[PDB]
Structures are given as structure tokens and as C-alpha cells.
């Protein structure tokens, strides 16, 4: 949830809607199996695409654009 | 593929036929199962032969003509 601290601040000046009592109320939990993450373009979908790490044996060099335009050029 | 480096002066100016652009354009891949040979007149059959060697062993002698002409000597 990217409105981490803009709940916060809203709770404890007072207001806020349902979702972010609930939101402050099961992220106080001190444990392990629960992760915060907080920042402008962190909880969003698009930091999320560079997280996947690349797999140790599977080829990292891209090949493919190459057979394309050898199919297309010379078939 | 004899002469390639006249081929390839020749397509460059804006030459060359089919046959000479469809193998230029197939060398074109960066590829480690590519092998080119320009050797010449050592792409023909009897340079081939020539170059390679023979066992001892192996029956490389005619035997059977000798043969029938023995045979043919009977009377």
C-alpha cells in the first residue's frame, strides 16, 4: 500500500477511511512474516518488474530478434 | 566457398547475384557453426584426396583383374 505514513499521520492527527485503520491496525505486527515496504514507485507495479532475478543456467544473450529478421530477410 | 573477398567487394558496390547475396546474407549470423573455407582449387576432389592420407593396411591395390586374367590364361 503505497499511503503507508500518509495513514499513519492521518490516525494519529485524527480521520481516515475504514480501509486504512485496518491497514495501520495488521501492519503494527512486529513479525518476520510480515514485509513493509514503503515509497513513491515501490509498492507500484512498475518496480515490481525488475525484481524477478534471471535464473543461474538458463542463456542470458538475446537471440531471438536475430532469427526473426534472418527468417524475414533471407525467407 | 572459393573466393569469397571478390564476392564481397562486388555486392558491396552494389553487384552480385542472387546466389552470392543469399550466402552472404546466411554468413551473416553470428553463429559459432559457421565455417567458411577459401582455399581454392583445394575445395576440389582431387585436392581432397590428395591431402588426405591412406592406412597401410587398407587394400587400395587392384587384385581382382589379375585375377580373371589368370583365369582366362587356362586352356
Known sequence: YPELKE????VSKGGGSE???AIVT???MA???VTVVGGGSKAYFNSFVEHLPYP???PRDNIVDELVEAIANLS
Chains 1, 2 share one sequence.
Not at 495513514?7 to 492521518?10: E, W
Open 7 to 10: 495513514a499513519i499521520t492521518k
Open 19 to 21: 480501509a486504512e485503520k
Open 26 to 28: 495488521l501492519k503494527n
Open 31 to 33: 513479525f518476520n512474516q
Open 56 to 58: 543461474v543456467l538458463f
